[PDB]
């Protein structure tokens, strides 16, 4: 048998090594469902697992939707694209709904510490943002807002409890700025957030230790890359 918590975490680590992220997410969902708090290491296993799962689905959906755009333009040729893009969409939506379900049923705890609350709320914003990437209906407004709320709630915590060099704070601001640019269609808000975030973390880089510096400068480079792309430096 061996579907006790420790064994589920062991199997999620093993699934990661084997690049079986569908399986890893399943083990992590089962581990979450045991009701114990996730350690920082455990949190990352859950995040990595689902990030990879949705990652592949989103990637596929983008491929199909671009093809569909070509198919429906003025003066092109003569349903499979739409049908199959809908299959992938439904599948992707199901995964987000699963992650969001876990976050609201077990992971988001008023009781949790600042770094973990931020982690999960950033996660809630990411997965709603993923739903908003494919949302076309009247639901788009509700979804967009559900992501805004989660990121903003996470922002508020990160800005009080964390230093501007915190990789979790940095990561959140990066994603929230991507949300503004892509989803909310607020490039001005996005550029500013990314600029401020980077500039504030830069002003504190001197204090950081060997390990801290590596994780922080990683995200800062992602912010800088985005800023270069968005502004045209």
């Amino acid at each position: 048998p061996h579907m006790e918590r420790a064994s589920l975490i062991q199997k999620a680590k093993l699934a990661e090594q084997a690049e079986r992220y569908e399986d890893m997410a399943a083990f992590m969902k089962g581990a979450v469902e045991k009701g114990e708090e996730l350690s920082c290491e455990e949190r990352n296993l859950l995040s990595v697992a689902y990030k990879n799962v949705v990652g592949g689905q989103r990637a596929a959906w983008r491929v199909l939707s671009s093809i569909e755009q070509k198919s429906n333009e003025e003066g092109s040729a003569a349903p499979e694209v739409r049908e199959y893009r809908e299959k992938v969409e439904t599948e992707l939506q199901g995964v987000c709904d699963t992650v969001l379900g876990l976050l609201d049923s077990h992971l988001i705890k008023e009781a949790g510490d600042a770094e973990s609350r931020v982690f999960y709320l950033k996660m809630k914003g990411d997965y709603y943002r993923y739903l908003a990437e494919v949302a076309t209906g009247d639901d788009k407004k509700r979804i967009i807002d559900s992501a805004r709320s989660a990121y903003q709630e996470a922002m508020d915590i990160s800005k009080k409890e964390m230093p501007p060099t915190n990789p979790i704070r940095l990561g959140l601001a990066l994603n929230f700025s991507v949300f503004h640019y892509e989803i909310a269609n607020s490039p001005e808000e996005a550029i500013s957030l990314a600029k401020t975030t980077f500039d504030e973390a830069m002003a504190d880089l001197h204090t950081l230790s060997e390990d801290s510096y590596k994780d922080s400068t990683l995200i800062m480079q992602l912010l800088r890359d985005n800023l270069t792309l968005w502004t045209g430096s």
Partner: peptide, 7 residues
């Protein structure tokens, strides 16, 4: 050339 987000 694609925007960066979560690692």
């Amino acid at each position: 050339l694609r925007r960066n987000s979560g690692c």
